[PDB]
Amino acid sequence: STGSATTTPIDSLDDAYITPVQIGTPAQTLNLDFDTGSSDLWVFSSETTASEVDGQTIYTPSKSTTAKLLSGATWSISYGDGSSSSGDVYTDTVSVGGLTVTGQAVESAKKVSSSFTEDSTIDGLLGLAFSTLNTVSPTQQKTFFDNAKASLDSPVFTADLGYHAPGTYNFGFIDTTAYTGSITYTAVSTKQGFWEWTSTGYAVGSGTFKSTSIDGIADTGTTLLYLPATVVSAYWAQVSGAKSSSSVGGYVFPCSATLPSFTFGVGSARIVIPGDYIDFGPISTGSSSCFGGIQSSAGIGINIFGDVALKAAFVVFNGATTPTLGFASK
Template identity: 25%
Template sequence: MKNIANFATSSLLVSVASAQVVQWDIQRRGGPAPRLSRRADGSVEEVITNEKTRGGYFATCSVGTPAQDLTLQLDTGSSDIWVPANSASVCESSLEGEGCTLGSYDYASSSTSEVINQEFKISYVDGSYSQGDYISETFGIGNVKLENMTMGLGLDTDIAYGLVGVGYALNEASVSQTRELYNNLPIVMRDEGHIATNAYSLWLNDLDASKGNILFGGIDTDKYMGDLIRVSIQQDSQTENFTSFQVQLTSLEAHSSSGDDALSSSSFPIPVVLDSGTTFSYLPQDLAEEVWREVGAEYTIVANDGSGVPLISCDLADSKGYFSFGFGGDGGPVIKVGMDELVIPSGTLNGQAVCQFGIQNFSGDPFLLGDTFLRSAYVVYDLENNEIGLAPTDFNATTSKIVAFPSQGAQIPSSTPAPSQDAANSGPSSAPNYSASKGFKDLSSSGSSGSGGSGSSGGSDGPDSAGSLAPALDFTQLIVMGASLGLMMFGSGMFLLF
């Protein structure tokens, strides 16, 4: 799960929408204050809450008849709605700050509830889980009621809130349990005419922003800059099915006042999943180490098994340096991610405030680009055409121009395809290995990442190669570190274990 870091809370307010779109707006504040509404033109708006204490984006929805309000985590990386039952032991805690403070569901109090089967079961990499029944129930988004919505009921769970997964149906938990699919939330919204096609766009805005949104069934052309460019979603290599929002990262460059570095990796093109349910971003070991050297991040051991995290001076959040993430080769979308989005306050270590660096290492694909990347991008998830649209975000945009998808299967409005992505996705990146003498090192007080090791950062004054390499993290190590220090937040969808 992703609820292991100590962050400030926030919430969301309503903005504008147009016909056949559903928009969930994000606004930072001290705590949730949901307001729901439906516009006269037939579009639907709903408040969601950016709950940094739990890690993720939350929506206040209604379940059952009469309606019971629950605040559920919205996740592009998973595909089921599930809610905690009020009888679950995790919801019965009387301790302050514990229990299901975001709401729980009373099955017996609803006149529209119906048990489908007892096969709901889902677990996560940190050992948390939820299991119980699949039910059919009324599910409310604003004033729109979706009848007979299939969802999981967590009768036995150690997670104090539920989730709203909006990924591919093939990623539903039921696939591993019963080999059966059902129509999940985006499909039902499409089939009932609330949106024209199974697609939505994501605008998280910057780390300290007051406002952002997730828009189902359309795009907002005032929320990004430049061109919206489409890249293909990659099929699962084993099943050849579309199960996650995996695209190919074909280049990564570092830019600072002292020059530019094109970073290299034996893994290019790199399969990465764009997942709003993951707070940090995770790249291959060799590439992560190059990134750390550029910024002077220091890999610090924080657990007895040798696990660690890259820590960085919190002052570097004010740096003007940035990284450029390229997709689809020449002419493909390029997203610039500034240091202010990558230096993440993460609590205390040995009595001192610490910041984690937002790009971390991982042991195997698929790799993940989470919120530390996604805040800098305007992302359109098109599940009908299996494409992702990307453009640089327009931070703190104050105007809105929503364009709805005109029909089922229509391509992303105002977008063009990456012209050379087929060639770029088929083999190693051909990005030139140009470099400056320092890259980001002028931004570091120490001038050395401390992680050591050899590498091809391009600079002649890199860290001492006699040091020991930072070990690649695996799921077990992530769990240990999260339990030890409370510094980490993880995505839900890509870490499902059935």
């Protein structure tokens, strides 16, 4: 089997991407944030505290003839941005782009933190990291990909995120029309539960490539590119007037600037992030100070190849017995 679904930016900055997901019988379609940095499929629901729901579409398990309470199971998750959610668990039928899993754990939120409430466009998350990170207790649950894997034509999924435009998540096949050149595969460590790999270096603009190992995670659920402070300083030093602002929380730059590109290495191959992809717009409405899309990972404890990086590539998440990542230009 295979599946193919379009993923759409939630706003004009590509702050996140939403993908429609069918849950239950008859189907209830929710727009979920596919997150290769976590491993829980959780949704706003009829159980979510009413004051914490503000425009989201909810899953109502009592209206699904295939929903079953997973007795005694609870979940609770906290994300790197300080947000969180928790609740109980059902199993139900879940379909993505024509690919169906029966008995998928659907984690129903009883509580969500303010940032989730405040984002009316995201109805929940669909985790695509390794199932060892799943938070369900006392019986850990499998991700949608893990449940589907054995049925797929090939044990893979791909992320093809757009810049200011829709893109695609495919399951079970590699669309050879969706990228240019060849796909370069690179080793993955699953020891922390992430799609963790080592970039071979970077360049800023037309500058020379610096060969240096950068361990980090491929994370579709993180907006920006978080790299070591040395690398990030070298990038922003090429932008007149750019500075790190403690009050804003990162590097800012004059909105009048034209940003240089940023290249990262995948083995001997190179992925080029155009400068425009690094502009996240005014820090507050009407400001002429703009927020940078490349930020320091110091204090986060891990480097994160988030959407800013991934959207410049066609990315293969290869879930073979020894997982690997593939990157192609597009």
